Amino acid sequence: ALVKEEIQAKEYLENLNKELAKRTNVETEAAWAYGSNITDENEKKKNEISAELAKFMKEVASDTTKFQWRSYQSEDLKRQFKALTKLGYAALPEDDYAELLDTLSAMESNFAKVKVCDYKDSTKCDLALDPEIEEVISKSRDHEELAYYWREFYDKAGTAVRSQFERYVELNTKAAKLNNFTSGAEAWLDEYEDDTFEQQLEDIFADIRPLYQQIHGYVRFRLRKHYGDAVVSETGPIPMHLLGNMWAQQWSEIADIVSPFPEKPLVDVSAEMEKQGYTPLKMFQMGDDFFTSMNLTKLPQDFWDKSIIEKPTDGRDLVCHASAWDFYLTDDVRIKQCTRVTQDQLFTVHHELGHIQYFLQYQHQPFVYRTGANPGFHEAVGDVLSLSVSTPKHLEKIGLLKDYVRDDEARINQLFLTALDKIVFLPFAFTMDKYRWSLFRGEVDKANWNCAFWKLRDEYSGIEPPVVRSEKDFDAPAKYHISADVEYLRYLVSFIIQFQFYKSACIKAGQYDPDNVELPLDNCDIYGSAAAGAAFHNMLSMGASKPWPDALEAFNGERIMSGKAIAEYFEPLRVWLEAENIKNNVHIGWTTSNKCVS
Ligand SMILES: *[C@@H]1O[C@H](CO)[C@@H](O[C@@H]2O[C@H](CO)[C@@H](O[C@@H]3O[C@H](CO[C@H]4O[C@H](CO)[C@@H](O)[C@H](O)[C@@H]4O)[C@@H](O)[C@H](O[C@H]4O[C@H](CO[C@@H]5O[C@H](CO)[C@@H](O)[C@H](O)[C@@H]5O)[C@@H](O)[C@H](O)[C@@H]4O)[C@@H]3O)[C@H](O)[C@H]2NC(C)=O)[C@H](O)[C@H]1NC(C)=O
Ligand SMILES: O=C(NC(Cc1ccccc1)P(=O)(O)[C@@H]1CCC[C@H]1C(=O)N[C@@H](Cc1c[nH]c2ccccc12)C(=O)O)OCc1ccccc1
Ligand SMILES: *[C@@H]1O[C@H](CO)[C@@H](O)[C@H](O)[C@H]1NC(C)=O
Ligand SMILES: *[C@@H]1O[C@H](CO)[C@@H](O)[C@H](O)[C@H]1NC(C)=O
Numbered sequence: 001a002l003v004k005e006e007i008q009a010k011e012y013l014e015n016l017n018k019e020l021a022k023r024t025n026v027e028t029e030a031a032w033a034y035g036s037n038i039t040d041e042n043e044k045k046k047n048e049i050s051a052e053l054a055k056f057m058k059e060v061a062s063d064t065t066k067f068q069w070r071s072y073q074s075e076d077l078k079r080q081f082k083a084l085t086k087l088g089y090a091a092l093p094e095d096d097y098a099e100l101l102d103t104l105s106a107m108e109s110n111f112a113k114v115k116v117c118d119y120k121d122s123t124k125c126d127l128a129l130d131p132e133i134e135e136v137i138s139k140s141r142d143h144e145e146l147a148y149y150w151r152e153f154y155d156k157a158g159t160a161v162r163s164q165f166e167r168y169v170e171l172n173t174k175a176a177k178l179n180n181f182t183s184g185a186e187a188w189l190d191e192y193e194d195d196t197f198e199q200q201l202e203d204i205f206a207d208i209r210p211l212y213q214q215i216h217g218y219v220r221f222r223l224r225k226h227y228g229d230a231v232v233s234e235t236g237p238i239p240m241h242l243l244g245n246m247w248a249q250q251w252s253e254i255a256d257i258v259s260p261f262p263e264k265p266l267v268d269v270s271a272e273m274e275k276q277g278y279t280p281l282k283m284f285q286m287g288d289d290f291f292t293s294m295n296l297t298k299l300p301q302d303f304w305d306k307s308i309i310e311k312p313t314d315g316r317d318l319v320c321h322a323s324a325w326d327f328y329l330t331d332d333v334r335i336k337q338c339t340r341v342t343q344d345q346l347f348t349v350h351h352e353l354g355h356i357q358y359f360l361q362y363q364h365q366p367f368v369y370r371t372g373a374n375p376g377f378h379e380a381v382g383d384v385l386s387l388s389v390s391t392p393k394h395l396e397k398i399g400l401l402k403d404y405v406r407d408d409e410a411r412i413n414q415l416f417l418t419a420l421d422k423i424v425f426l427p428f429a430f431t432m433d434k435y436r437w438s439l440f441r442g443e444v445d446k447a448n449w450n451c452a453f454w455k456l457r458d459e460y461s462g463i464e465p466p467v468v469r470s471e472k473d474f475d476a477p478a479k480y481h482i483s484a485d486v487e488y489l490r491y492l493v494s495f496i497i498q499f500q501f502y503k504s505a506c507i508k509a510g511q512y513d514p515d516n517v518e519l520p521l522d523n524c525d526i527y528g529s530a531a532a533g534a535a536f537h538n539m540l541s542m543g544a545s546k547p548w549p550d551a552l553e554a555f556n557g558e559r560i561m562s563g564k565a566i567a568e569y570f571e572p573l574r575v576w577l578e579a580e581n582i583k584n585n586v587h588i589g590w591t592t593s594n595k596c597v598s
């Protein structure tokens, strides 16, 4: 009978979860070694261990059918069993799985090994994205130099892996169908446990889109005054290489030329960090300080002993796109970041430590629950702190911002600066997965794959390549997450929900009151707030033990993903910007791009 079986099932899960942590530890160690040191030997080791774990997962999924788990009384037990039935890529036949792993490492290693030649010196051909190319894209205001680096990078990181990407799409689809999802789109969306999730995001995006159009319009106007109308047209999509980022995902790097009030202060603390002798170690210690100040968990000794926080100075190849690592034991958590001493990197450190904090908060949970409530939650944690770190309030406290007068004009500058990071990103993030979903779902013919990418970038973001592209190019994998097969919707979700978290954390900290002019949301610092920390502990400690609305409820009593909070934060900017665009007769919207030839 079922009563006795459910008792046996509980013991089965308890033992199996422990076995899964231990087996995954081994896979994670091999993946860490490869990411830290790209070699053919390490590639082989990583992929062989994964193949072994996949084989065990197949046996696990098979064993779940021996339990009448759908008949059980315990929602908790049922939730754990359901999690075990979900094989993902491990559902593929042995050979197909091995081919997929080979395809994935081929794409990640290609991305990591990209080197271009110096614009001024065709002899020097050892410039990597991190840090050499990214430095030029962010700092150069020479549009031809910018276009050179754009083309060189996209050709090498994107086009070079078209055939691999094609095989990846095929195997991803085969895997999804073996799990009885329609495609990889549905497989990814399953992580949000909500059949209306896509529509919810369409609705929120539609609400924020008009504000994005205004920012777009204003930035284009300002870029015309800098580069001239030969480079930037009034009515067309913005040439993306002028936006301070290789993928135009955030535009904060060009704030100095597009800021609302150029004669007023613009927060840029990179120079002060260098002046005060900041190091990657100091930055991480400061991040640790922020979490502990909120009564959250201190970084364990394993973290300091084992993390890589600076780019290695030997000749080795490695993945320099930052990552946080859970090894599924106790306190064995790690970061690999090629850290630089900049304002942006200080935020990145806090983002990374948000992942690490989540690992520590839920490490007592059964293995299947040791992940985010949904992927967006994991990405949001560190950003909530970064929002307060970025405030003039906090930056003055740590002596990085000097002689600052927070008048109305300085406030608009700061809000705009934040919008260039937070609002601008929304259409970008949506398109990363809208694109891959359409390929996964078989909605785009292979002959149209490249211009399908640029069409979305045009439609949603109103940006375009600096030069004419065609179906002879393949540009999507020039973005890390696309080469590395990392779902991107998590970041769109994060950028929305992080303002729900921030607003509530600020209210809890007594740092935000909508009726108190002295406590604006955009200058809230949650540093040292145990009350804000309590909310985080209540939520993060749950891991994936409950559907995400219950985790949100544990934080602030709400159960609904909402764009209300992000709109609330940016409302003073919206009012000012709508008026400024009218005052300057700023053209809003864009004609269809001519930069991708069919
Ligand atoms: C994705 O969807 C797939 C369907 O599109 C699905 O594939 C199906 O999985 C079924 C298992 O759940 C499987 O059903 C079995 O069928 C066997 C015979 O099928 C053969 O002939 C078919 C032609 O008619 C072919 O198409 C097949 O390829 C096969 O060759 C049966 O022998 C088998 O039966 C046994 O098991 C049932 C299970 O009973 C349940 O559990 C307990 C038993 O302890 C019961 O008390 C309880 O009431 C409950 O019913 C027993 O009742 C029975 O006595 C036998 O022991 C079973 O029906 C099916 O064949 C398979 N394919 C298809 C095309 O349907 C995938 O599993 C899905 N994948 C995922 C990951 O979810
Ligand atoms: O390490 C990562 N992940 C990252 C990348 C990665 C994923 C999978 C394998 C390997 C690596 P990253 O998001 O820290 C990560 C590394 C630094 C920035 C982050 C990023 O990619 N951000 C996005 C979005 C973005 C751009 N600018 C910003 C600024 C602030 C927040 C996000 C953001 C990007 O495109 O780079 O994941 C840890 C994890 C484990 C288990 C569950 C959940 C999470
Ligand atoms: C990189 O890996 C090689 C073998 O693949 C190993 O011999 C070497 O020690 C590693 N290098 C570093 C710097 O760890
Ligand atoms: C710190 O957190 C602990 C539990 O983690 C809690 O019991 C304690 O009240 C918190 N300290 C403060 C000052 O709130």
Ligand SMILES: [Zn+2]
Pocket: 351, 355, 378, 379
């Ligand atoms: Zn992250």
